[PDB]
Amino acid sequence: HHHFNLPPGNYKKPKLLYCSNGHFLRILPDGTVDGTRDRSDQHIQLQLSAESVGEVYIKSTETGQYLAMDTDGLLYGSQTPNEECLFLERLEENHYNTYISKKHAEKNWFVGLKKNGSCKRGPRTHYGQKAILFLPLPV
């Protein structure tokens, strides 16, 4: 139920995902997900991998945990790449990357960070917010 405009999606090298709200997506050891402004944080280095075209897994290079979103729309870190770890990576405003929960794609639940660094819950996100806009940057 979504467009198919895709960004370059270069997954060879690890990278950072910088949210337009000012934070780099971070996956913590305890399985917690949030955002930080510190570009030196060792938990913001991510390794993207593709499943079918346009689908990706987002994994912590440091902890090996996979980004995921539960039945309640909350982001967490998973040790295994289950159905909740698959995201549809799409271009937005012709320049940014957005990630929609494949599992909950019909509900438009995106990966999103608030200006205060906390994660947004799936239902609280939607097209048009800066919280869902990410820029893939070099580590």
PDB file of all heavy atoms in Angstrom, residues 96-124:
ATOM      1  N   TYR A  96      15.298  12.320   1.179  1.00  0.00           N
ATOM      2  CA  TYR A  96      15.426  11.594   2.436  1.00  0.00           C
ATOM      3  C   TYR A  96      14.998  10.142   2.364  1.00  0.00           C
ATOM      4  O   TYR A  96      14.384   9.707   1.394  1.00  0.00           O
ATOM      5  CB  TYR A  96      14.605  12.289   3.537  1.00  0.00           C
ATOM      6  CG  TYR A  96      14.999  13.723   3.842  1.00  0.00           C
ATOM      7  CD1 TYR A  96      14.329  14.796   3.245  1.00  0.00           C
ATOM      8  CD2 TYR A  96      16.030  14.003   4.735  1.00  0.00           C
ATOM      9  CE1 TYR A  96      14.678  16.123   3.532  1.00  0.00           C
ATOM     10  CE2 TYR A  96      16.390  15.318   5.042  1.00  0.00           C
ATOM     11  CZ  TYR A  96      15.716  16.371   4.441  1.00  0.00           C
ATOM     12  OH  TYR A  96      16.069  17.663   4.760  1.00  0.00           O
ATOM     13  N   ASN A  97      15.370   9.403   3.406  1.00  0.00           N
ATOM     14  CA  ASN A  97      15.018   8.006   3.575  1.00  0.00           C
ATOM     15  C   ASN A  97      14.001   7.860   4.696  1.00  0.00           C
ATOM     16  O   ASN A  97      14.150   8.482   5.743  1.00  0.00           O
ATOM     17  CB  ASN A  97      16.236   7.189   3.999  1.00  0.00           C
ATOM     18  CG  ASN A  97      17.185   6.910   2.868  1.00  0.00           C
ATOM     19  OD1 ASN A  97      17.177   7.578   1.845  1.00  0.00           O
ATOM     20  ND2 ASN A  97      18.014   5.912   3.054  1.00  0.00           N
ATOM     21  N   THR A  98      12.962   7.062   4.472  1.00  0.00           N
ATOM     22  CA  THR A  98      12.013   6.784   5.537  1.00  0.00           C
ATOM     23  C   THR A  98      11.953   5.255   5.624  1.00  0.00           C
ATOM     24  O   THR A  98      12.295   4.548   4.663  1.00  0.00           O
ATOM     25  CB  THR A  98      10.605   7.336   5.267  1.00  0.00           C
ATOM     26  OG1 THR A  98      10.101   6.805   4.029  1.00  0.00           O
ATOM     27  CG2 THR A  98      10.632   8.875   5.222  1.00  0.00           C
ATOM     28  N   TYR A  99      11.567   4.755   6.796  1.00  0.00           N
ATOM     29  CA  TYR A  99      11.496   3.328   7.030  1.00  0.00           C
ATOM     30  C   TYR A  99      10.151   2.960   7.644  1.00  0.00           C
ATOM     31  O   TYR A  99       9.837   3.359   8.766  1.00  0.00           O
ATOM     32  CB  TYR A  99      12.646   2.926   7.967  1.00  0.00           C
ATOM     33  CG  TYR A  99      14.014   3.190   7.347  1.00  0.00           C
ATOM     34  CD1 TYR A  99      14.645   4.422   7.492  1.00  0.00           C
ATOM     35  CD2 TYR A  99      14.636   2.223   6.556  1.00  0.00           C
ATOM     36  CE1 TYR A  99      15.885   4.688   6.848  1.00  0.00           C
ATOM     37  CE2 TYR A  99      15.856   2.464   5.912  1.00  0.00           C
ATOM     38  CZ  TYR A  99      16.475   3.709   6.060  1.00  0.00           C
ATOM     39  OH  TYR A  99      17.649   3.956   5.374  1.00  0.00           O
ATOM     40  N   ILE A 100       9.353   2.204   6.899  1.00  0.00           N
ATOM     41  CA  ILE A 100       8.036   1.780   7.366  1.00  0.00           C
ATOM     42  C   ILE A 100       8.064   0.321   7.793  1.00  0.00           C
ATOM     43  O   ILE A 100       8.633  -0.521   7.112  1.00  0.00           O
ATOM     44  CB  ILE A 100       6.989   1.919   6.251  1.00  0.00           C
ATOM     45  CG1 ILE A 100       6.851   3.396   5.852  1.00  0.00           C
ATOM     46  CG2 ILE A 100       5.633   1.394   6.735  1.00  0.00           C
ATOM     47  CD1 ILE A 100       6.097   3.598   4.569  1.00  0.00           C
ATOM     48  N   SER A 101       7.447   0.039   8.930  1.00  0.00           N
ATOM     49  CA  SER A 101       7.352  -1.315   9.436  1.00  0.00           C
ATOM     50  C   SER A 101       6.650  -2.128   8.358  1.00  0.00           C
ATOM     51  O   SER A 101       5.528  -1.816   7.974  1.00  0.00           O
ATOM     52  CB  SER A 101       6.527  -1.320  10.726  1.00  0.00           C
ATOM     53  OG  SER A 101       6.008  -2.618  10.991  1.00  0.00           O
ATOM     54  N   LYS A 102       7.310  -3.147   7.825  1.00  0.00           N
ATOM     55  CA  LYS A 102       6.641  -3.930   6.803  1.00  0.00           C
ATOM     56  C   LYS A 102       5.442  -4.598   7.475  1.00  0.00           C
ATOM     57  O   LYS A 102       4.322  -4.548   6.966  1.00  0.00           O
ATOM     58  CB  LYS A 102       7.586  -4.973   6.196  1.00  0.00           C
ATOM     59  CG  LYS A 102       6.922  -5.827   5.122  1.00  0.00           C
ATOM     60  CD  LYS A 102       7.883  -6.863   4.513  1.00  0.00           C
ATOM     61  CE  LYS A 102       7.169  -7.680   3.433  1.00  0.00           C
ATOM     62  NZ  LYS A 102       7.966  -8.817   2.874  1.00  0.00           N
ATOM     63  N   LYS A 103       5.668  -5.187   8.644  1.00  0.00           N
ATOM     64  CA  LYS A 103       4.599  -5.869   9.357  1.00  0.00           C
ATOM     65  C   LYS A 103       3.348  -5.014   9.531  1.00  0.00           C
ATOM     66  O   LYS A 103       2.219  -5.507   9.418  1.00  0.00           O
ATOM     67  CB  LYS A 103       5.082  -6.301  10.735  1.00  0.00           C
ATOM     68  CG  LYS A 103       4.092  -7.161  11.483  1.00  0.00           C
ATOM     69  CD  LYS A 103       4.766  -7.865  12.648  1.00  0.00           C
ATOM     70  CE  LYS A 103       3.772  -8.697  13.449  1.00  0.00           C
ATOM     71  NZ  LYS A 103       3.013  -9.640  12.571  1.00  0.00           N
ATOM     72  N   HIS A 104       3.542  -3.727   9.785  1.00  0.00           N
ATOM     73  CA  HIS A 104       2.420  -2.826  10.018  1.00  0.00           C
ATOM     74  C   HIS A 104       2.334  -1.750   8.938  1.00  0.00           C
ATOM     75  O   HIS A 104       1.856  -0.643   9.191  1.00  0.00           O
ATOM     76  CB  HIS A 104       2.595  -2.190  11.404  1.00  0.00           C
ATOM     77  CG  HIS A 104       2.691  -3.193  12.519  1.00  0.00           C
ATOM     78  ND1 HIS A 104       1.580  -3.778  13.093  1.00  0.00           N
ATOM     79  CD2 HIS A 104       3.765  -3.752  13.130  1.00  0.00           C
ATOM     80  CE1 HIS A 104       1.965  -4.655  14.006  1.00  0.00           C
ATOM     81  NE2 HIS A 104       3.287  -4.659  14.047  1.00  0.00           N
ATOM     82  N   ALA A 105       2.785  -2.089   7.732  1.00  0.00           N
ATOM     83  CA  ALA A 105       2.776  -1.139   6.631  1.00  0.00           C
ATOM     84  C   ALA A 105       1.397  -0.590   6.315  1.00  0.00           C
ATOM     85  O   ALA A 105       1.276   0.557   5.956  1.00  0.00           O
ATOM     86  CB  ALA A 105       3.387  -1.776   5.395  1.00  0.00           C
ATOM     87  N   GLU A 106       0.361  -1.407   6.464  1.00  0.00           N
ATOM     88  CA  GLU A 106      -0.982  -0.950   6.163  1.00  0.00           C
ATOM     89  C   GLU A 106      -1.420   0.141   7.127  1.00  0.00           C
ATOM     90  O   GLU A 106      -2.372   0.873   6.850  1.00  0.00           O
ATOM     91  CB  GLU A 106      -1.982  -2.111   6.197  1.00  0.00           C
ATOM     92  CG  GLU A 106      -2.186  -2.759   7.566  1.00  0.00           C
ATOM     93  CD  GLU A 106      -0.935  -3.450   8.096  1.00  0.00           C
ATOM     94  OE1 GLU A 106      -0.301  -4.221   7.337  1.00  0.00           O
ATOM     95  OE2 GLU A 106      -0.608  -3.242   9.286  1.00  0.00           O
ATOM     96  N   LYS A 107      -0.719   0.258   8.250  1.00  0.00           N
ATOM     97  CA  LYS A 107      -1.030   1.279   9.259  1.00  0.00           C
ATOM     98  C   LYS A 107      -0.096   2.496   9.173  1.00  0.00           C
ATOM     99  O   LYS A 107      -0.246   3.466   9.919  1.00  0.00           O
ATOM    100  CB  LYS A 107      -0.937   0.667  10.660  1.00  0.00           C
ATOM    101  CG  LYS A 107      -1.984  -0.416  10.942  1.00  0.00           C
ATOM    102  CD  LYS A 107      -1.976  -0.877  12.407  1.00  0.00           C
ATOM    103  CE  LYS A 107      -0.928  -1.949  12.685  1.00  0.00           C
ATOM    104  NZ  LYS A 107      -1.183  -3.179  11.882  1.00  0.00           N
ATOM    105  N   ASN A 108       0.852   2.460   8.244  1.00  0.00           N
ATOM    106  CA  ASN A 108       1.805   3.563   8.098  1.00  0.00           C
ATOM    107  C   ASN A 108       2.562   3.837   9.392  1.00  0.00           C
ATOM    108  O   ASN A 108       2.588   4.960   9.869  1.00  0.00           O
ATOM    109  CB  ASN A 108       1.086   4.840   7.649  1.00  0.00           C
ATOM    110  CG  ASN A 108       0.728   4.819   6.168  1.00  0.00           C
ATOM    111  OD1 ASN A 108       0.538   3.754   5.577  1.00  0.00           O
ATOM    112  ND2 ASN A 108       0.624   6.003   5.567  1.00  0.00           N
ATOM    113  N   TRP A 109       3.172   2.805   9.958  1.00  0.00           N
ATOM    114  CA  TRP A 109       3.950   2.985  11.166  1.00  0.00           C
ATOM    115  C   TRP A 109       5.413   3.108  10.734  1.00  0.00           C
ATOM    116  O   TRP A 109       5.991   2.157  10.208  1.00  0.00           O
ATOM    117  CB  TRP A 109       3.774   1.799  12.090  1.00  0.00           C
ATOM    118  CG  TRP A 109       2.450   1.754  12.839  1.00  0.00           C
ATOM    119  CD1 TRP A 109       1.373   2.577  12.684  1.00  0.00           C
ATOM    120  CD2 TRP A 109       2.091   0.815  13.857  1.00  0.00           C
ATOM    121  NE1 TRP A 109       0.357   2.205  13.549  1.00  0.00           N
ATOM    122  CE2 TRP A 109       0.781   1.119  14.279  1.00  0.00           C
ATOM    123  CE3 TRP A 109       2.759  -0.265  14.456  1.00  0.00           C
ATOM    124  CZ2 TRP A 109       0.119   0.389  15.269  1.00  0.00           C
ATOM    125  CZ3 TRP A 109       2.103  -0.999  15.444  1.00  0.00           C
ATOM    126  CH2 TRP A 109       0.793  -0.665  15.837  1.00  0.00           C
ATOM    127  N   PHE A 110       5.992   4.290  10.942  1.00  0.00           N
ATOM    128  CA  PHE A 110       7.383   4.576  10.573  1.00  0.00           C
ATOM    129  C   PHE A 110       8.323   4.537  11.774  1.00  0.00           C
ATOM    130  O   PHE A 110       7.905   4.550  12.934  1.00  0.00           O
ATOM    131  CB  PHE A 110       7.547   6.001  10.001  1.00  0.00           C
ATOM    132  CG  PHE A 110       6.656   6.328   8.825  1.00  0.00           C
ATOM    133  CD1 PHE A 110       5.307   6.625   9.023  1.00  0.00           C
ATOM    134  CD2 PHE A 110       7.175   6.400   7.532  1.00  0.00           C
ATOM    135  CE1 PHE A 110       4.483   6.994   7.960  1.00  0.00           C
ATOM    136  CE2 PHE A 110       6.342   6.775   6.432  1.00  0.00           C
ATOM    137  CZ  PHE A 110       5.008   7.069   6.655  1.00  0.00           C
ATOM    138  N   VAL A 111       9.610   4.515  11.458  1.00  0.00           N
ATOM    139  CA  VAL A 111      10.663   4.615  12.447  1.00  0.00           C
ATOM    140  C   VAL A 111      10.739   6.136  12.573  1.00  0.00           C
ATOM    141  O   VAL A 111      10.798   6.850  11.572  1.00  0.00           O
ATOM    142  CB  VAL A 111      12.015   4.107  11.909  1.00  0.00           C
ATOM    143  CG1 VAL A 111      13.096   4.364  12.928  1.00  0.00           C
ATOM    144  CG2 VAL A 111      11.928   2.640  11.591  1.00  0.00           C
ATOM    145  N   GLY A 112      10.691   6.651  13.785  1.00  0.00           N
ATOM    146  CA  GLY A 112      10.752   8.090  13.929  1.00  0.00           C
ATOM    147  C   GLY A 112      11.291   8.523  15.268  1.00  0.00           C
ATOM    148  O   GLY A 112      11.060   7.862  16.287  1.00  0.00           O
ATOM    149  N   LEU A 113      12.013   9.635  15.265  1.00  0.00           N
ATOM    150  CA  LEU A 113      12.591  10.169  16.495  1.00  0.00           C
ATOM    151  C   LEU A 113      12.086  11.580  16.756  1.00  0.00           C
ATOM    152  O   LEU A 113      11.957  12.390  15.824  1.00  0.00           O
ATOM    153  CB  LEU A 113      14.115  10.214  16.395  1.00  0.00           C
ATOM    154  CG  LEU A 113      14.837   8.876  16.212  1.00  0.00           C
ATOM    155  CD1 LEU A 113      16.335   9.133  16.020  1.00  0.00           C
ATOM    156  CD2 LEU A 113      14.599   7.986  17.431  1.00  0.00           C
ATOM    157  N   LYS A 114      11.814  11.867  18.023  1.00  0.00           N
ATOM    158  CA  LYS A 114      11.324  13.176  18.430  1.00  0.00           C
ATOM    159  C   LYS A 114      12.499  14.107  18.652  1.00  0.00           C
ATOM    160  O   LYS A 114      13.625  13.663  18.736  1.00  0.00           O
ATOM    161  CB  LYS A 114      10.508  13.059  19.730  1.00  0.00           C
ATOM    162  CG  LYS A 114       9.215  12.260  19.604  1.00  0.00           C
ATOM    163  CD  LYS A 114       8.565  11.999  20.956  1.00  0.00           C
ATOM    164  CE  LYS A 114       8.182  13.289  21.659  1.00  0.00           C
ATOM    165  NZ  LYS A 114       7.176  14.058  20.874  1.00  0.00           N
ATOM    166  N   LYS A 115      12.222  15.399  18.749  1.00  0.00           N
ATOM    167  CA  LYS A 115      13.257  16.385  18.995  1.00  0.00           C
ATOM    168  C   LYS A 115      13.931  16.167  20.351  1.00  0.00           C
ATOM    169  O   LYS A 115      15.053  16.626  20.553  1.00  0.00           O
ATOM    170  CB  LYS A 115      12.675  17.797  18.958  1.00  0.00           C
ATOM    171  CG  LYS A 115      12.024  18.169  17.641  1.00  0.00           C
ATOM    172  CD  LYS A 115      11.393  19.554  17.736  1.00  0.00           C
ATOM    173  CE  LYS A 115      10.616  19.894  16.482  1.00  0.00           C
ATOM    174  NZ  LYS A 115       9.481  18.957  16.267  1.00  0.00           N
ATOM    175  N   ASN A 116      13.252  15.497  21.289  1.00  0.00           N
ATOM    176  CA  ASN A 116      13.871  15.238  22.594  1.00  0.00           C
ATOM    177  C   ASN A 116      14.653  13.916  22.621  1.00  0.00           C
ATOM    178  O   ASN A 116      15.019  13.428  23.689  1.00  0.00           O
ATOM    179  CB  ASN A 116      12.821  15.254  23.724  1.00  0.00           C
ATOM    180  CG  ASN A 116      11.717  14.241  23.511  1.00  0.00           C
ATOM    181  OD1 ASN A 116      11.920  13.204  22.869  1.00  0.00           O
ATOM    182  ND2 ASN A 116      10.546  14.523  24.068  1.00  0.00           N
ATOM    183  N   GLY A 117      14.896  13.336  21.448  1.00  0.00           N
ATOM    184  CA  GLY A 117      15.669  12.108  21.385  1.00  0.00           C
ATOM    185  C   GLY A 117      14.945  10.813  21.669  1.00  0.00           C
ATOM    186  O   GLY A 117      15.536   9.734  21.561  1.00  0.00           O
ATOM    187  N   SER A 118      13.673  10.891  22.038  1.00  0.00           N
ATOM    188  CA  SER A 118      12.934   9.672  22.321  1.00  0.00           C
ATOM    189  C   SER A 118      12.268   9.168  21.039  1.00  0.00           C
ATOM    190  O   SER A 118      12.016   9.940  20.121  1.00  0.00           O
ATOM    191  CB  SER A 118      11.876   9.930  23.403  1.00  0.00           C
ATOM    192  OG  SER A 118      10.879  10.838  22.945  1.00  0.00           O
ATOM    193  N   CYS A 119      12.033   7.866  20.976  1.00  0.00           N
ATOM    194  CA  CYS A 119      11.385   7.249  19.824  1.00  0.00           C
ATOM    195  C   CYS A 119       9.907   7.556  19.787  1.00  0.00           C
ATOM    196  O   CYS A 119       9.258   7.657  20.835  1.00  0.00           O
ATOM    197  CB  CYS A 119      11.494   5.724  19.871  1.00  0.00           C
ATOM    198  SG  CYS A 119      13.143   5.069  19.864  1.00  0.00           S
ATOM    199  N   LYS A 120       9.369   7.685  18.581  1.00  0.00           N
ATOM    200  CA  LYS A 120       7.936   7.884  18.435  1.00  0.00           C
ATOM    201  C   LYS A 120       7.304   6.497  18.329  1.00  0.00           C
ATOM    202  O   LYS A 120       7.935   5.546  17.862  1.00  0.00           O
ATOM    203  CB  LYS A 120       7.620   8.683  17.178  1.00  0.00           C
ATOM    204  CG  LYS A 120       7.848  10.153  17.351  1.00  0.00           C
ATOM    205  CD  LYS A 120       7.361  10.922  16.154  1.00  0.00           C
ATOM    206  CE  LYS A 120       5.874  11.159  16.194  1.00  0.00           C
ATOM    207  NZ  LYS A 120       5.494  12.278  17.095  1.00  0.00           N
ATOM    208  N   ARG A 121       6.065   6.364  18.783  1.00  0.00           N
ATOM    209  CA  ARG A 121       5.393   5.068  18.687  1.00  0.00           C
ATOM    210  C   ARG A 121       4.747   5.029  17.287  1.00  0.00           C
ATOM    211  O   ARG A 121       4.325   6.062  16.771  1.00  0.00           O
ATOM    212  CB  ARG A 121       4.338   4.958  19.795  1.00  0.00           C
ATOM    213  CG  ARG A 121       3.802   3.563  20.055  1.00  0.00           C
ATOM    214  CD  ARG A 121       2.940   3.527  21.335  1.00  0.00           C
ATOM    215  NE  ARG A 121       1.662   4.229  21.187  1.00  0.00           N
ATOM    216  CZ  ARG A 121       0.562   3.689  20.674  1.00  0.00           C
ATOM    217  NH1 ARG A 121       0.566   2.429  20.247  1.00  0.00           N
ATOM    218  NH2 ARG A 121      -0.552   4.403  20.597  1.00  0.00           N
ATOM    219  N   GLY A 122       4.669   3.846  16.686  1.00  0.00           N
ATOM    220  CA  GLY A 122       4.108   3.706  15.355  1.00  0.00           C
ATOM    221  C   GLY A 122       2.886   4.555  15.024  1.00  0.00           C
ATOM    222  O   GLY A 122       2.907   5.291  14.039  1.00  0.00           O
ATOM    223  N   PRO A 123       1.803   4.481  15.814  1.00  0.00           N
ATOM    224  CA  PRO A 123       0.591   5.265  15.545  1.00  0.00           C
ATOM    225  C   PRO A 123       0.802   6.767  15.547  1.00  0.00           C
ATOM    226  O   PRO A 123       0.072   7.499  14.888  1.00  0.00           O
ATOM    227  CB  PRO A 123      -0.367   4.821  16.652  1.00  0.00           C
ATOM    228  CG  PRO A 123       0.076   3.446  16.968  1.00  0.00           C
ATOM    229  CD  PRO A 123       1.590   3.566  16.946  1.00  0.00           C
ATOM    230  N   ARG A 124       1.802   7.224  16.291  1.00  0.00           N
ATOM    231  CA  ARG A 124       2.069   8.653  16.383  1.00  0.00           C
ATOM    232  C   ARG A 124       2.847   9.216  15.196  1.00  0.00           C
ATOM    233  O   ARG A 124       3.019  10.441  15.062  1.00  0.00           O
ATOM    234  CB  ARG A 124       2.807   8.990  17.691  1.00  0.00           C
ATOM    235  CG  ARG A 124       2.035   8.717  18.992  1.00  0.00           C
ATOM    236  CD  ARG A 124       0.601   9.223  18.925  1.00  0.00           C
ATOM    237  NE  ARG A 124      -0.327   8.122  19.196  1.00  0.00           N
ATOM    238  CZ  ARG A 124      -1.509   7.970  18.607  1.00  0.00           C
ATOM    239  NH1 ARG A 124      -1.922   8.851  17.706  1.00  0.00           N
ATOM    240  NH2 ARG A 124      -2.267   6.925  18.909  1.00  0.00           N
TER     241      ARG A 124
END
